Design a binder for this molecule. Sequence first.
Ligand SMILES: Cc1cc2nc3c(=O)[nH]c(=O)nc-3n(C[C@H](O)[C@H](O)[C@H](O)COP(=O)(O)OP(=O)(O)OC[C@H]3O[C@@H](n4cnc5c(N)ncnc54)[C@H](O)[C@@H]3O)c2cc1C
Length: 453
Amino acid sequence: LSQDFVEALKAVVGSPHVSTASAVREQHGHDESMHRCQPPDAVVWPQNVDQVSRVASLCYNQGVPIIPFGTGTGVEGGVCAVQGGVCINLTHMDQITELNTEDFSVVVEPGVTRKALNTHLRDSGLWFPVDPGADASLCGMAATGASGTNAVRYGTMRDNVINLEVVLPDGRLLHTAGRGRHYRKSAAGYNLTGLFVGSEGTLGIITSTTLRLHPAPEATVAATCAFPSVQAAVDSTVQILQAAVPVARIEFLDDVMMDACNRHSLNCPVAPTLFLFHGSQQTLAEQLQRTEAITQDNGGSHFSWAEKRNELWAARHNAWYAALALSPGSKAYSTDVCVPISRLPEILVETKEEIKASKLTGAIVGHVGDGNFHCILLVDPDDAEEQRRVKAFAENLGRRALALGGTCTGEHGIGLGKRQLLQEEVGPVGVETMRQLKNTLDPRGLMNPGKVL
Ligand SMILES: Cc1cc2nc3c(=O)[nH]c(=O)nc-3n(C[C@H](O)[C@H](O)[C@H](O)COP(=O)(O)OP(=O)(O)OC[C@H]3O[C@@H](n4cnc5c(N)ncnc54)[C@H](O)[C@@H]3O)c2cc1C
C-alpha cells in the first residue's frame, strides 16, 4: 500500500485508527481455523458509519481489497487476506440502540456481542437466543448466517434478523428492509435482508443489525443423558423431533468429545451423550415425560439434572477448545454438514466409524436437533501430510452429506474451505446466479475476494 493511500485512510478515521504494523496485521490475518494466516496490508478501525462508507469508497476506487473483520472467531478463513488489502475492524462501533421491548426488537452495532446484548437486557424479561459458542459480534453472526444450541426452538440468525444496515462495496448505504423499519412479515419487493445474511462480507459491510428478541422462558430444566452407542443417541434425537417435543436445546457429544469436555471444564459418564426444556412447571413435566420415554427405549440413562446449568452449557460452548486441548499445539478444522433428519443416524454413525478407522483425532459435537453436526479434526500445523488427510476426510464427509440431499454447511459458512463443495451443492446455474448477484453489488471483485465463490 502506497504512502498517499495510507494518509488518505488516516484522513478518514484518524491516525490512531490506521495501522500498517506487521504484528497488528498478523493478528487480523487469521481466525480460529487452521487456515494459514494471510495478513492484510493495513487494519482500519472506523468510528461511525460515515467513516465506514468513506473507507470503503477509498479502497474500492483505488482497487484495494476490503476484508470486514468482526471478532475473528470464524472457522472457515473468512478474514484471511488472500489478496492483501485493508482489513476493516468494525468493533469500535459498539452501541445498542432502538431497544423496542414492546415490539420485541433491538438494533446493534458490530462491536456488540451476544453477551453484551443479553447483559443489557437483564431485567427486561427479553433475551436474544442465537448462541454460537464463541462471544462473537452479532453483526458477524448475521454475516455468517450463524446458529447455535437454541436454534432448534428459537431459530437461526436468518430467522431472527429483521433488518440490516449495509455499506455496499462502493460506499453507498443500504437499509435492506428500509431505514428504521421493523415488523413481523412483509411481501414488499424482494427480500434484501435474507440476501445479506450469510454473505460473509463478500457483498458489503454490515454496520448494524435489527434483531428479533424473545420472551425469557417461564421455567427452565437442563439435563444430560448417556447412551450406549452413537446410534442410540441419534435415534433418540430423531424420534424426539418426530414426536414434536418442543425441546429448547438438544446437543450431541460423542464419547471423545464428552471426555475432552470433562478434562477441559464436568464429570459426566464418558459415553455418547445428549445435553438437553422451556415452559411452565406443568408444561415441562409433559415434555420431560415424553422425552424420557423415548430416550429410555433407546437405552438412555435416567436424566442427570442456577449455576450447574450455566457450567453445563459453558462446557458445550467451549467444545472447540476442549478438542484442541487433546493435542496441545494443534489447530482444528471442522465439518458442518446438515442433512434431512431421517438420514442423520446413517451419516453420524458412518462418521464415527470413519474417524475410528482413521489415524486422525476427531471429536463429534452438534446441533443434531437441526440435523447438523461438527466433526472437529485436529491438525499438526507443520505435518503437511496430516493436513492433506484432514482435508480429504472433510471433503469426503461433505460429499456424503450432499449425496443424502443435505448441505455442506449448516452454520459456519464457506469461506476458503468449502468452495468446491458449494459448486457441487447448487450446480452450474446456482453458481452462476450467485456470481451474478456478487457482480452487481461488487463489480470490481474487491469485497473479501477469494471467499465463498
Ligand atoms: C469456540 C467456537 C464456537 C463456535 N460455535 C459456533 C456455533 O455454534 N455456531 C456458528 O454458527 N458458529 C460458531 N462459531 C463460528 C463463529 O463464532 C461464527 O461464525 C461467528 O458468526 C463469526 O463472527 P465473527 O464476528 O467472530 O467473525 P469473523 O471471523 O470476524 O468474520 C467471519 C466472516 O464474516 C465476515 N464479517 C464479519 N463481520 C462482518 C460485518 N460486520 N459485515 C460483513 N461481513 C462481516 C468476515 O469478512 C468473514 O468472512 C464458533 C467459533 C468458535 C471459535
